[PDB]
């Protein structure tokens, strides 16, 4: 999953898991 809500665009894909 992701740690936060929102659009999960390319930049914030380093946060998956």
């Amino acid at each position, epitope marked *: 999953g992701y740690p936060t809500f929102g*659009e999960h*665009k390319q*930049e914030k894909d380093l946060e998956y898991g």
Partner: antibody, heavy 117, light 111 residues
């Protein structure tokens, strides 16, 4: 890969509303940023805002906000910079940059010159 | 509002020479993720900007290895080991860490 096909030069009068078009090619427009970046001759490069057509979400530079209304024809894959109630500042070249599968944005439009007599 | 400036504003070099464009922000552009996401774009006359360098020192696919950035904090450097006539144009230094996002002043690299 990424191709952004912009409109050509248009020559208009003030107190008009003109929507500049930035056609996506080679991608669906809901997986990426649409940014608009302004460049006046009297300015460098100035980020306007961004639209993610995917769920309507926009983020603004407050300075140009609500002079610029950013919208998108979602299914036709074409993003639109509606520059409404013009002054002298609308006389500019606009560039349309597309989100990079990395961490920023890869390749820019072709330039849509809005000249205001 | 993070102000990114560049020096010089115009950098004359020879063919095959090494160019060094010095960029400096008004505030640290380190992202909350812990990474620095500093990009350099090349805009040629009559053309739109194109991505050459991202994440400081990462090279975009299709970009010659001649291009590489460096530095840290607020003071960063665009290094180009082999400047040719095909590398002529205006380079911009863009930070995507602080909203609203901001670009650099712009340096014209020329032969």
């Amino acid at each position: 890969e990424v191709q952004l096909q912009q409109s050509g030069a248009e020559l208009v009068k003030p107190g008009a509303s003109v929507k500049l078009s930035c056609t996506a090619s080679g991608f669906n427009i809901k997986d990426t940023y649409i940014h608009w970046v302004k460049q006046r001759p009297e300015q460098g490069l100035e980020w306007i805002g961004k639209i993610d057509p995917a769920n309507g979400n926009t983020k603004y530079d407050p300075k140009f906000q609500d002079k610029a209304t950013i919208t998108a024809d979602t299914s036709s894959n074409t993003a639109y910079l509606q520059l409404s109630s013009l002054t002298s500042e609308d006389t500019a070249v606009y560039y349309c940059a597309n989100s990079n599968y990395w961490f920023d944005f890869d390749y820019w439009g072709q330039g849509t010159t809005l000249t205001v007599s | 509002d993070v102000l990114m400036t560049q020096t010089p504003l115009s950098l004359p070099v020879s063919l095959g020479d090494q160019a060094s464009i010095s960029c400096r922000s008004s505030q640290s552009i380190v992202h909350s993720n812990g990474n620095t996401y500093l990009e350099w774009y090349l805009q040629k006359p009559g053309q739109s900007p194109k991505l050459l360098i991202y994440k400081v020192s990462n090279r975009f696919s299709g970009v010659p290895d001649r291009f590489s950035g460096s530095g840290s904090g607020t003071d960063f450097t665009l290094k180009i080991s082999r400047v040719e006539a095909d590398d002529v144009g205006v380079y911009y230094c863009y930070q995507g860490s602080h909203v609203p996002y901001t670009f650099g002043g712009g340096t014209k690299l020329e032969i």
